[PDB]
Amino acid sequence: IDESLYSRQLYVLGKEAMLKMQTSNVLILGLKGLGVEIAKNVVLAGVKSMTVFDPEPVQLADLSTQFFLTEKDIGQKRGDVTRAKLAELNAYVPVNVLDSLDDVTQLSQFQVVVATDTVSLEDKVKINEFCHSSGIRFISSETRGLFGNTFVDLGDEFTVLDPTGEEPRTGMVSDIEPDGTVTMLDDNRHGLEDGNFVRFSEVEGLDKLNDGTLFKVEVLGPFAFRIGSVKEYGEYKKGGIFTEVKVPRKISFKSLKQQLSNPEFVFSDFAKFDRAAQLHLGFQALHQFAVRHNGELPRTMNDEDANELIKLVTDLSVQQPEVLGEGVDVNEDLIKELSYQARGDIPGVVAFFGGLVAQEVLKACSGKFTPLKQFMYFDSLESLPDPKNFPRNEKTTQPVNSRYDNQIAVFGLDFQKKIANSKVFLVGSGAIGCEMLKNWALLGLGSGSDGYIVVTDMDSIEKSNLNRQFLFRPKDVGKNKSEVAAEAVCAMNPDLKGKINAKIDRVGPETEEIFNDSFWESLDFVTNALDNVDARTYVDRRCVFYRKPLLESGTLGTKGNTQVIIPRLTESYSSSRDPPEKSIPLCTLRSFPNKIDHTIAWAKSLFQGYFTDSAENVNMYLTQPNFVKGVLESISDSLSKPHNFEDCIKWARLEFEKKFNHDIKQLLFNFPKDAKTGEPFWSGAKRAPTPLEFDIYNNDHFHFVVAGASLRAYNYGIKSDKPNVDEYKSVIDHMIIPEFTPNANLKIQVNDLVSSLPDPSTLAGFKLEPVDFEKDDDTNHHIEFITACSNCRAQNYFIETADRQKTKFIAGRIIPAIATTTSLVTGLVNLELYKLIDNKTDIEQYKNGFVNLALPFFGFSEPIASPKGEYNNKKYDKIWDRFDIKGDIKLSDLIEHFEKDEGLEITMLSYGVSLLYASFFPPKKLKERLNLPITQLVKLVTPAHVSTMILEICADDKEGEDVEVPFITIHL
Amino acid sequence: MQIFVKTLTGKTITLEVESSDTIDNVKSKIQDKEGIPPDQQRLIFAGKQLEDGRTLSDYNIQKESTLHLVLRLRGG
Numbered sequence A: 001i002d003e004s005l006y007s008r009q010l011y012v013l014g015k016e017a018m019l020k021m022q023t024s025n026v027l028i029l030g031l032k033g034l035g036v037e038i039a040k041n042v043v044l045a046g047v048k049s050m051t052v053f054d055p056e057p058v059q060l061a062d063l064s065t066q067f068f069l070t071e072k073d074i075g076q077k078r079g080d081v082t083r084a085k086l087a088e089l090n091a092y093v094p095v096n097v098l099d100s101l102d103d104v105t106q107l108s109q110f111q112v113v114v115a116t117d118t119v120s121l122e123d124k125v126k127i128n129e130f131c132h133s134s135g136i137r138f139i140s141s142e143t144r145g146l147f148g149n150t151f152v153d154l155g156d157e158f159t160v161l162d163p164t165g166e167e168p169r170t171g172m173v174s175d176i177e178p179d180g181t182v183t184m185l186d187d188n189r190h191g192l193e194d195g196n197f198v199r200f201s202e203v204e205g206l207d208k209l210n211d212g213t214l215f216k217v218e219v220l221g222p223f224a225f226r227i228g229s230v231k232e233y234g235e236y237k238k239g240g241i242f243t244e245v246k247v248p249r250k251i252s253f254k255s256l257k258q259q260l261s262n263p264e265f266v267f268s269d270f271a272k273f274d275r276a277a278q279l280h281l282g283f284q285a286l287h288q289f290a291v292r293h294n295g296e297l298p299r300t301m302n303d304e305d306a307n308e309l310i311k312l313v314t315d316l317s318v319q320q321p322e323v324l325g326e327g328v329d330v331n332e333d334l335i336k337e338l339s340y341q342a343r344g345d346i347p348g349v350v351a352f353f354g355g356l357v358a359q360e361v362l363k364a365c366s367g368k369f370t371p372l373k374q375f376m377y378f379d380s381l382e383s384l385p386d387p388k389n390f391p392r393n394e395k396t397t398q399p400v401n402s403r404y405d406n407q408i409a410v411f412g413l414d415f416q417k418k419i420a421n422s423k424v425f426l427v428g429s430g431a432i433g434c435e436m437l438k439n440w441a442l443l444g445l446g447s448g449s450d451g452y453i454v455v456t457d458m459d460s461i462e463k464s465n466l467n468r469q470f471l472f473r474p475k476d477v478g479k480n481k482s483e484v485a486a487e488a489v490c491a492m493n494p495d496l497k498g499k500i501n502a503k504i505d506r507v508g509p510e511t512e513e514i515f516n517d518s519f520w521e522s523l524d525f526v527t528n529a530l531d532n533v534d535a536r537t538y539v540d541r542r543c544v545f546y547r548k549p550l551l552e553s554g555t556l557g558t559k560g561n562t563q564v565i566i567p568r569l570t571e572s573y574s575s576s577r578d579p580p581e582k583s584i585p586l587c588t589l590r591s592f593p594n595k596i597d598h599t600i601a602w603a604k605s606l607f608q609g610y611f612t613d614s615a616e617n618v619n620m621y622l623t624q625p626n627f628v629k630g631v632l633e634s635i636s637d638s639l640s641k642p643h644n645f646e647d648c649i650k651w652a653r654l655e656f657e658k659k660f661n662h663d664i665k666q667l668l669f670n671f672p673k674d675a676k677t678g679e680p681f682w683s684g685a686k687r688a689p690t691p692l693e694f695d696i697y698n699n700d701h702f703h704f705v706v707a708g709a710s711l712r713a714y715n716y717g718i719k720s721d722k723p724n725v726d727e728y729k730s731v732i733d734h735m736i737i738p739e740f741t742p743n744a745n746l747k748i749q750v751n752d753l754v755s756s757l758p759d760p761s762t763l764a765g766f767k768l769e770p771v772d773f774e775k776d777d778d779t780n781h782h783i784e785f786i787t788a789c790s791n792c793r794a795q796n797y798f799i800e801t802a803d804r805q806k807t808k809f810i811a812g813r814i815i816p817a818i819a820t821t822t823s824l825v826t827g828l829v830n831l832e833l834y835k836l837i838d839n840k841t842d843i844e845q846y847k848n849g850f851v852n853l854a855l856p857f858f859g860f861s862e863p864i865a866s867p868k869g870e871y872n873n874k875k876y877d878k879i880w881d882r883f884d885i886k887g888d889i890k891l892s893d894l895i896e897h898f899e900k901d902e903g904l905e906i907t908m909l910s911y912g913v914s915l916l917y918a919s920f921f922p923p924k925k926l927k928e929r930l931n932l933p934i935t936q937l938v939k940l941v942t943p944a945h946v947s948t949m950i951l952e953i954c955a956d957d958k959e960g961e962d963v964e965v966p967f968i969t970i971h972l
Numbered sequence B: 001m002q003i004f005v006k007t008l009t010g011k012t013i014t015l016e017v018e019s020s021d022t023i024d025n026v027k028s029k030i031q032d033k034e035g036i037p038p039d040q041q042r043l044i045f046a047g048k049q050l051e052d053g054r055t056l057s058d059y060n061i062q063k064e065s066t067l068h069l070v071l072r073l074r075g076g
């Protein structure tokens, strides 16, 4: 498994799943937008081979969602044209065309068969039956306008090896009673659920309990669970770690034929659970209609065909009585919209199912995650504009011989033209950005004479990006993300030539001169495509300030979300909080690690100190007269100095001794293995360490020295560069290793001289080269050092060692990421975007989305309305309103204005972190303050680009009492 | 009555509640069971996000109903 390509995805799927996918041959039937989208995500993910079958000729209307088709491809076979472009996505994945599927027996070569919207229901049934009865995994999906479905049949016996992909739960135990009641140490939560399984280690007094045996969990509150009787195992003394184990689950799927009569549903939207059974008949009725009308779907917006489809569904509910159940009528209005939209081909919907179905493919190859069982239906009918604004009829939704015809089919020509005339800002050109830009290419968004796209990203393209940022190729590595992405989508849709402004600027407080008042005011809306919470907060504050709609989204492995922020309507992104990152106690890091996370963070800090901070501090000391407690000692060590690589080896060997032998002996001097508080000192989170005796045959000991030496050599400009054990031995064997001598006067925290330095005169021209941490270059020794260093400390404290991949995950702070979730959430964003185009003011039409493809789970919620407030019986919006003040006002006038116009006594006035005025200030301070313009007042407490100043205020109302009030904007 | 809360990780939580309980009170019960402070909880049911100051019955939450505890994700 090529870690350098598959890095981020490996953290989602794991090595075993990806090994299994790499043995899997996948066939996709149909390469309209849906098939190409599934194929893109599957090829990127990495299977053994991809085969596509679509001998149908390319027509112009296919380009609605098929981003690998161009106008020059018209007349040629969809398969043939698409094959070459798919092949480019992943060089490890062979892409073949199947020329004909005359013999259903050809399917025997494949592990997974996907039937898309080019396959008739009749044929799907025949293909599924062959697949089911042969042990071939079958998946189908079809999209029809704003509607879509998927069906999964993984055969009679399918094994799920990991249902969720979540990290197994672990925890420290303080007691196990003879009935099997396990008590957690202190206030540690086990996080377990009834029916989970755990294994045990280090449970003293119960010996065989620790052999890898699994125990069923009965949860008794958040700090206790029961495993059943342990009398026979012995009697509990002390210690213990539980580890959660995921057991395999055998599951049975029914064939498509059986599932047509008695379907099993997963819901996409619980607000719409009733529609699933309705659409199940609807989708079947569409195929029956096509049978009766020589392969034709219902005519667009046609009332006559809609009535036929309604009659077809009504008739089918009789033949399939278990679908709707007793006393439930045909939802005629719903079926009517399905008929009306049947020919539609909508990017957002194609992307939603493309992502979802591709994930189902990966599950079918690997046994990783819980498969969809077995049908899912989706609609996004809220995306439809108000018919008052954009009427839908046979005239307005007619083909105009255009790539957008199957979008016009749903929305009408005028709405399509409004999409084209949107001015949009996209912040980020990575995974979400690429999927966004593709979607926008397919929409022709910003291609009209009044429209444009601004996309910005400061970052360049790297190898690990290519697994999920599909607009980029290996040739593009090193180039700018935004610029490359812009060019790629213009090649997809020439309508966007001259309409995308690809910028390389980083959005933040430092680029407000570029992204100024004028820039934001011109925009219709903003879309986030970010990987950082602060970046999102920054953009959200700008959209609040300029009153612009914001489309927000995010992913983490199989998990994803979308949020819509609407001026004067909803709360914004910053209005609510997400869990903060958990902070490790300093004493746990310093002296008492019990998890690999602790040893990794310690190793990374050590890496920083040794090879970055040390070098920087020396360089500053030698060039800066001003320079002059821990810092001082590092400078002297750095300067009292290797002349060759051998000296670097010696240094690292001595560091080994210091960190993993001497310091440990010092800690044990302070707190002997036997020490007591009643209870032992070394218990629970405190694990009695053992000093390491350097053994070059131990991989961690060896690589600590190799990497430490190579990094020290880099600091001092010594030529470095597999490492040979005997070569390193020929240095280390001759070394005298100083004995440990205990410092009696050293205090160790349990719970959370100067003229020795050499004269910079004597070392002129001397400079250290500081290391810049680079997690994605496997030749620089960085991860090698952090892994080895962490592992030696893990050895000290009897913590299980980790490999390079896990260490890189934690030390590199890598976000797990995969194309499937990215394309799915981006689809959902684009279904909301339609609502922005129609300027919807009904909050109940909008949907914030929440997904986890592992489960699979789909859920939506209406956005929260902006909280409203009052002062002196005047109502205001707590998110959207502000006090706009014209001109560089004098403080006294500002105070006067608020008393006269608002009935507010300003009690406090601030600009950023600076306090400018308070009602408790004394006359002397007030005199130097009251008569100054705000800029001068700010100057007194502390730029030409600046046109506005944001001020915060506390205030009392007319009846004297404190009152929450909005911010002030001073317009300069 | 019994209701269920499913997290985005697949975990099911069982709560004993009354129709007239506030959303604030359900969140307090979730905090006891899971440790998540009420301000960090996003509960969704039948197309709505549950807000403080309203009751379960306001959202037509019935016996054996499932609520979803959901999250916002930072990657992209």
Ligand SMILES: *NS(=O)(=O)OC[C@H]1C[C@@H](Nc2ccnc3cc(-c4cccc(SC(F)(F)F)c4)nn23)[C@H](O)[C@@H]1O
Pocket: A427, A428, A429, A430, A431, A432, A456, A457, A458, A459, A481, A505, A506, A507, A508, A509, A529, A530, A531, A532, A534, A535, A536, A538, A539, B075, B076
């Ligand atoms: N999910 S991904 O595949 O990794 O792709 C994510 C994109 C997002 C790009 N980042 C990016 C693009 C444009 N502007 C900014 C600004 C920031 C940023 C980040 C942290 C702090 C701050 S200062 C603050 F918070 F705004 F006040 C700004 N990141 N930006 C990535 O380059 C990647 O391509």
